[PDB]
Subunit: 175 residues, 6 copies
């Protein structure tokens, strides 16, 4: 099952992200259910907005807000929902919604899948336009969602990204 | 697995439909296998016809013809094969093929995924064109299938739809 | 799971192929992981090339090179990653990479899915253009892959294809 | 403009078809307007049906029903609306709607675009399934169109197809 | 050419909209050039946003801001860039950018293309969600465009929509 | 028409490329016809290869081999056949086929469409992978084309690219 995917080969620099939502997809937000492992429809987003990158989670991790660390994963072509990609974390985008702190890591395909992301070691190496586009996306994608709201605190580095993976991996191994 | 998906949170008005065939897809008819839970090719349909809605089934249900209640689920964007959507039943389309009675429910996305279908409580609230299109589809999609044939008896209401879900859920819990 | 799919109903003439890569897809090479059964990204291919047919494997088989018999499966429309298709083997394309012998069978949809492939009994009945296109594909798709290289030895018949399925099925039942 | 496209290089065996509707497209019926040459929406078809082949017309031709000879053009990949393909006529499908006689030729890509259709010289060489699929399509695509109706008289040979191109080309050069 | 398309058959209730940008398309903003009639790239929008409807213009019209009346045209399936659709105006969305007043009409497919929009006579009959989605789109699609900015004044009725078509058609016939 | 598109606003650094083939498209090679301006099918390529970038030509230019300077134009999303993009030339890929010298320029979207390509001034600033992918493509896309063959001489700089645009623009204004 998707529930038995390792967190990574070598955490926190060598991790697996379970893809839930492909880059550039229609605006359906899917979630792996932690009970069945199946792909569930969470909602049909009301804005005319698309995820700017592939969107998923690291298995066996528990972020401060009670669920797995979310990850955005840029790729030359959109991935399949339910596929697992080997990645390297490179950066984190801090935000608050109406559940508190909810960081989104950014991680690039690992060098064994591809050499293309090898120049990207830290948050400053991501294209400006891509960072601006991502932030705008999480700023606005819920604008028409009555019970929901989001505030974007800003970008941090790969070491802040890694420390979140370790803290969330440890917290899953007790709680 | 897809085999451990509940029938619904609150049957028969609050159910889960396991998607097998997306709206507007190429004409490949897929089926979840009840042994592995994998998505199997059932056939390559010979007509130049597409499913007018997403097409799947309610798990843990057994309809008179020896398999799960089939459901059609209209959505603003096509869903992924193997995804689970939370829905409300709204209507039923009665038909006979060469296995007897084989109803197809129609159910709309539940209000928690979306407000868009909230005005649709019963069969009369579905667009005319959509009902006519669906009926035409099941009338004709097998026209070129030598061993197979279909007759479309007509539309019934949400209460007829719900009573089929309850009767099929009970029959799965003994047979 | 995909790990409990039978090898076929009646080997070697009646087999199941687990689809990993759809015909005409973006150039992402996916692999079912034999540990979780999930779909994993293996790499982002560097050539501007697409798989000319659907690409997968027969479960419960072990080819000389330490993994399941690979299969190419032509279909009127591209299949979904992780779907299982019932097929008949019709031919085999022999090649060496930097792991030795790595045949790729060709198999067509079985007559119960479709009548369209029924005229194809053996390797000579496949369109010339399709065989030439496939061979060119495996010749070149790795051209830009530093550690990797491929040589295409040529086409053999359905009986050579079947004997490989039997030898690989037997070898999985001991090793 | 599309209005200055020749009828063919060497009529009736070497012709140009102006594409209006791609194979496998959403069910929007487009028409080149003979006044502007622009692509106009003619209607949104109500059936869940797709054109089984690319659909267009031969320029400078006038069929008995007051407009250009319609052509269906099978191709390995769908064409762009408004593109011109060089073809060879191979067959004709006779029908009546509520304007009388309205044949649809079938023509395959000419050998200079492709060798793939070179084995198809006459109507008997087209796949059975394709002929059956096309006929079913024109039989039914208007079923839900109140003012409209279609009857399918059947298949004729390449020489009947060519004689229609010549008669329609001559009739355009007087009327 | 697209430059010789009439404004409508019977203005202002029966008009032609020249499509420039399909509903749900990648975020490339195209423009017909009034010199050649060709489709030109105007820019690659920086937001992760899609046009919620098809987007074009009425030919032979000049709006206060020095170019043709812009129109949004909802359709069951996305249209082709450069296609002409027959529509009925139903409503107008008023806004200011850094060129002043720049209304966008909404118009639905005319009854001869389709019966589906026949219930929509005025702005109040458009789905709420669709109006909210459109307004959000024009509010935000330029957020990352340095020299550009937009303010959304709100919705007006079909009679306000028609009077704009007449005033813009008259102004094109002198200026 | 597409025949009246200028060569550029300010040649050779500010040019218009007429798109013929979108990035990542099915393998149909289209050509604008210089007689009608329509999009013609030139052939259905036999390899399983896709154009790695959008592919078109500069109007009013005549390259040594008797037709317009060909251009490859990388873009965040694939363009429409027959659209015109404003670009800046950045590099040239020299090759011989069986008509002699047939350079392909590379040009990026001009800064007014987008800021994304602004860091790319010369051939060395294009991603390595992209240059390698393009060269591999023109090396191999004709491998199965009996009468045709291609040899790839290599990359030159923006000044070599510009001098070709000027020489080809001058040669069109006499010959």
């Amino acid at each position: 099952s998707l529930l038995n995917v390792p967190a990574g080969k070598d955490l926190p620099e060598d991790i697996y992200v379970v893809i839930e939502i492909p880059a550039n997809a229609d605006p359906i937000k899917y979630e792996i259910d932690k009970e069945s492992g199946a792909l569930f429809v969470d909602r049909f987003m009301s804005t005319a907005m698309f995820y700017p990158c592939n969107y998923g989670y690291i298995n066996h991790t528990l972020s401060l807000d009670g669920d797995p660390v979310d990850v955005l994963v840029p790729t030359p072509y959109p991935l399949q929902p339910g596929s697992v990609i080997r990645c390297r974390p490179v950066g984190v985008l801090k935000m608050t919604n109406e559940a508190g702190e909810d960081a989104k890591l950014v991680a690039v395909p690992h060098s064994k899948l591809s050499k293309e992301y090898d120049h990207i070691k830290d948050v400053n190496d991501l294209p400006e336009l891509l960072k601006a586009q991502i932030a705008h996306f999480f700023e606005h994608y819920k604008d028409l969602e009555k019970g929901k709201w989001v505030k974007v605190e800003g970008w941090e580095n790969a070491e802040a990204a890694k420390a979140e993976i370790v803290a969330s991996f440890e917290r899953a191994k007790n709680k």
